[PDB]
Design a protein around this motif. Sequence first.
Motif, short mmCIF file in Angstrom:
data_model
loop_
_atom_site.label_atom_id
_atom_site.label_comp_id
_atom_site.label_asym_id
_atom_site.label_seq_id
_atom_site.Cartn_x
_atom_site.Cartn_y
_atom_site.Cartn_z
N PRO A 177 0.83 -1.21 0.00
CA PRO A 177 0.00 0.00 0.00
C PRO A 177 0.85 1.25 0.00
O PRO A 177 1.85 1.34 0.71
N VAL A 178 0.46 2.22 -0.81
CA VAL A 178 1.04 3.55 -0.76
C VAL A 178 -0.06 4.52 -0.35
O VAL A 178 -1.04 4.69 -1.08
N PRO A 179 0.04 5.16 0.81
CA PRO A 179 -0.99 6.11 1.21
C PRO A 179 -1.02 7.34 0.32
O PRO A 179 -0.03 7.70 -0.33
N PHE A 202 -5.64 5.73 -0.68
CA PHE A 202 -4.46 5.09 -1.24
C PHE A 202 -4.25 5.57 -2.66
O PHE A 202 -5.19 5.96 -3.35
N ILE A 203 -3.00 5.54 -3.10
CA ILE A 203 -2.67 5.84 -4.48
C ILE A 203 -2.99 4.62 -5.33
O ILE A 203 -2.48 3.52 -5.06
#
Lengths: 104, 517, 103
Positions: free
Chosen positions: C20-22, C37-38
Amino acid sequence: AHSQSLDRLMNPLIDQYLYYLNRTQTASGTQQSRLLFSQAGPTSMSLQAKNWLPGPCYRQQRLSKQANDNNNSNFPWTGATKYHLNGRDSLVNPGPAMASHKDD
Amino acid sequence: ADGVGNSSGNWHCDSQWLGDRVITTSTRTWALPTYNNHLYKQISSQSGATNDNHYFGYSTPWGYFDFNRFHCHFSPRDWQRLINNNWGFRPKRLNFKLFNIQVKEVTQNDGTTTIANNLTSTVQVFTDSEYQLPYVLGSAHQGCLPPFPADVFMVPQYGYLTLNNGSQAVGRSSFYCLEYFPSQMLRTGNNFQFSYTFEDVPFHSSYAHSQSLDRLMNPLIDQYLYYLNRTQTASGTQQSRLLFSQAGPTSMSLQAKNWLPGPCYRQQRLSKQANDNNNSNFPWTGATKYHLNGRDSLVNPGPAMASHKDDKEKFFPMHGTLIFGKEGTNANNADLENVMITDEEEIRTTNPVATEQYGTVSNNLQNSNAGPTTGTVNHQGALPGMVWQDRDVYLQGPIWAKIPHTDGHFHPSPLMGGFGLKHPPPQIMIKNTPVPANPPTNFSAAKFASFITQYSTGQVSVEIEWELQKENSKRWNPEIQYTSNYNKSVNVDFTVDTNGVYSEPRPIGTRYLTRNL
Amino acid sequence: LMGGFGLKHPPPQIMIKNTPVPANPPTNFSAAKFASFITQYSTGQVSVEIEWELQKENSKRWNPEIQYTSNYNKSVNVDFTVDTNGVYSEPRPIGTRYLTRNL
Ligand SMILES: Nc1ncnc2c1ncn2[C@H]1C[C@H](O)[C@@H](COP(=O)(O)O)O1
Ligand SMILES: Nc1ncnc2c1ncn2[C@H]1C[C@H](O)[C@@H](COP(=O)(O)O)O1
C-alpha cells in the motif's frame, strides 16, 4: 528541580485510547441514570489514566507570614502535627518532604 | 547504499516460539505528514478551562513511533499460547528498523490533487538514547502500530508539557528543540536501525492464585495459639470476664495469621444494570482523586485492587479499571454496551476489593463506663507483612512505562500495567526535512513561510525477544484456559468483517493458570 | 480424481501483492485507518522451469502403434495456432495414452 509535573507527563497533542466515565447522568431531557464513557484528551487532562501517584503525605497546619492573617490564639503545641511515642507527644519536624505551598 | 531501485528491507511479521523464549516481529506501513508547517509552537490550555485542566507546553513538527501496546507484537493466537502455557513473561531485547522510505510531493490545482515522487527529498530520524527529551510514551495515547498487520497507520505528532502556573509558564519551563539532536537523514534507499536491551525486570504474573490469603491454614489441625473468645460471661448474670480459646477449623476468621492484604485506596462502586445507580452526575464530584499542587486529579485506574467481591459480577469500581472501546465507538459519551470494561477479579485472594474498606480499627480506649468504638479505614498505606498483586496486562494495553527519575519510588510498577523501567525503550523521532519553495530573487532576511507540501511513507519493523516462565504445577484437575466459543456466529472473533474492519471483541487478561500462595 | 500427481508436499503457493502507498495524510493526527491510497498496479515477468523424468517404450510389438497426428487435409485455420485476429485456440483435448503395453 523537575521540568515537569507528575500529572503532566502526557503527550498534550494526542488523545488516549482508554475510556473513562464522563457522565453518570443523561445530558438532556428528563434526568436519568445512565453511564457514558469518553476518551480523555488534551482538553481535560485531569481525567486521564496515569501510572504514578504523588509521594506520601502527613498533613501540616498552614501559617501566614503577613501579620493579622493568622488566627488569634496560641497553638504551636495544641494545633500541631505530632507523633505519639511511648505516651509522649512529639512534634513531627520538619517532617516528610512535602511542598511548602501551592502555585501563587 | 542502495539507490532508487533497490528495496532497503524485507517484510518480517512472523512469531517464533523457542520454548524458553518467544521472538515476536511486527512489520507495518506508516505515513508521516508535515505537522504544523515545520514549526515549533507553544500550546497552552485556553483560559476559561478549570484550574485542574490547565497546561503549558510545546508542539513540534516531529513525529514518533510507539509500539508500547501488546497486540502490536502478538496475534490473538500467539497471545493465547502465552497466557495458557506460562506463569510469567518479560521482555529481553528488541530490534527496530525503518526501510523502504518514500517521500511524495503534493500539488493542488483547482479541485484536483497530484502526488509525485520526490526522489531527492530527505527524512530525519533519531532515537533518544540518553532520555534527554520528555518521555510521552507511557501515557496510553493512541497512535501505536495497528493490531492487524495489513493496516496502515499515521505517525503521531510529538509534543510535550512542562511547568505552568495557571495557563502561563514559570521560568523553569523547559523548551526542547529536537533539531538540536544529532539525527540521521535518509533518502529513498537509506534505512535506519538500532538495537535495545531491556534491563532486568520482574516477570509479570500470568497466574491467578489457588488460595486466598487468609486461608493458608491447615483446615484439619487446631492452633496452639489462644485468642480472646469472650469478653463477657456466657451464662448467669452478665459479668465482665476474659475467656480464651484456640482457634481452629470451625472459626478460621479468628486465627493468628502472618500476612496482611495489599494497600487500599478506596473506589466508588457502580452498577452495570441501568437504574440501580444513583441519579445524579458524579464522575468528578464523587470520585477518588489525588490533590497535587492545587490541582485535583483522578486516581485512575489506581492501585491494584480486586474489582468485586464474591458473587457480585454486575458492579465495577468507578475509575478503577481499564476500559477499552469496541470497534466504531465514539470518543465522546459512549454507551456502556460499547465499551469493554476489564476485570481485576483474579486478585481477590490478596488485594482488597476496590469498592470496599480496607478494614476496621479501634478509635478510643474502653473502660467500664465507655464501650469500645471503632473506626473504618478507607485508605491504607504499606504495613509490614503486606502482600499484593500487580494489575494485569491485556492484549491491548501498555507494555511498559518509564519510572520517573526521583529520589524515591515505591514498588515502581505502572498502575495501568506492565513493566516499570528506569531506561525504557528509547523514543524514535521522525520528521520530513523542510523543502523551500522558490525564494525571492532579492535577499530578504525574513524566514521562509513558503514550503513544498509533501509527506513520506515507509515500512517499520519491531522485533522483541520475550522470556518465558513455564508452568511447573502439580495440580491434578484441569486448569481454566482461554478458549474461543464453539457456537456459530455471523462474524468470527478477532477477525475482519465483510467491510474489511478488524475488531477485537473482548479484552484478554493474562491470568488463567493457577499457582498457590 | 481430475488427474495428475497426488502430492503430500505439492509445489508451494507463491503469493504477491502491491504494498500500500498512502495518499496525503491529514495535517492533524487522527487514529482512524487510511482509506485513501494511491491507485497503482504492477507488471513483470515470470519463469517456470520444471524437469520431467521420462520412461521409454521397451515394446516388442510388431505392428505400428497409434500416434497422435495432425490431419493432412487443408483447412482455413491450422490447429493449435493463432487465427487472423490473433486469438490462440486449442481445437481438441489431447490425452497422453497412445502407446500400448500388455497387462
Ligand atoms: N515492575 C517493577 N519494575 C522494577 N522493579 C520492580 C517492579 N515491581 C517491583 N519492583 C521492585 C520491588 C521488588 O521487591 C523487587 C523485586 O526485584 P527482583 O528482580 O524480583 O529481584 O523489585
Ligand atoms: N498418485 C499417487 N501419488 C502418491 N502415491 C500414490 C499415487 N497413486 C498410488 N499411490 C500409492 C499406492 C500405490 O500402491 C503406491 C505405489 O508407489 P510406488 O512409488 O510405485 O512404489 O503408491
